[PDB]
RNA sequence: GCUGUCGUCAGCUCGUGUCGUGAGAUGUUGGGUUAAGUCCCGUAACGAGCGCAACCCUUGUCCUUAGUUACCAGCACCUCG
């Protein structure tokens, strides 16, 4: 979008160079002052393509899981995957969401049943020792598992925002077989992702721009 | 069928998922804490069962119900029980 914007946030910076993948080294411009620098005129491309995929795929009621757990990152995906729809996470991701959705839905069911008890009217009328565990259990499930209450289904298509954290999330994608949409970076590992983007981590800017691209482009795109 | 013992020690397993060509392994490992696989947070694991704890009996405080063959604060009789 406009070049110098992103130019501006924090896109074209690496993690360093002792710690580097050469699988990427076709996206990198060069490396300058001990820091790797990505190649910013290659990566738009291939974000838009990202941008126009998804916007087409949301036409239809389609729904992409986002996943943005980090050291602060997870935040701000809770709103931007908020509105619209798109299911998300944003805590540490529990493995077996994908492949072992079965049993994922017996935990969605009981923390649905422990809200509408919680929200019924205050059911937990008794000991305030058991209606804090009650609560305290409530709230573990929820941010183990929020963005998952919806989505009865399993998800055709999933984004990410750091594919070397979340390797076991790209991992059963690749398993079950859905497309993954994924912002790289030049310490992590281009393969299994299906719509690369090769951007920067650990950027508030950063992350926060590409949430908004993605969110107004499923916007758009899901007028129908 | 019934019983001792390790031992009233805190352990013993399963479903789905994942890793390994396999026997298997993860869950059940880590840092704390507890009498306890008790609990917290982390964590390719997510849940469940038998165990631990709880529900049972007795004792230790108090309230109500009730005063016979039980008791005697107060009144009286008293042959002073
Ligand atoms: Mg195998
Ligand atoms: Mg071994
Ligand atoms: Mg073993
Ligand atoms: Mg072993
Ligand atoms: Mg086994
Ligand atoms: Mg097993
Ligand atoms: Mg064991
Ligand atoms: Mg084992
Ligand atoms: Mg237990
Ligand atoms: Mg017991």
Known sequence: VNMRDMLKAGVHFGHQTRYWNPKMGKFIFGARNKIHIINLEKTLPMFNEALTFVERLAAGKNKILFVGTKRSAGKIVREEAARCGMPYVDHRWLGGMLTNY????????????????????????????????????????????????????????????????????????????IPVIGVVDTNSSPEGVDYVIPGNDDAIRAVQLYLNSMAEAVIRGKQG
């Open 102 to 177: 079965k049993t994922i839905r017996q935990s969605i069911k009981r923390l649905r049943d422990l809200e509408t008890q919680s929200q019924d009217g205050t059911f937990d009328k008794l000991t305030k020792k058991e209606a804090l565990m009650r609560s305290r259990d409530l709230e573990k499930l929820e941010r183990s598992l929020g963005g998952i209450k919806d989505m009865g289904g399993l998800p055709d298509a999933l984004f990410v925002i750091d594919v070397d954290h979340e390797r076991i999330a790209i991992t059963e994608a690749n398993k079950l077989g």
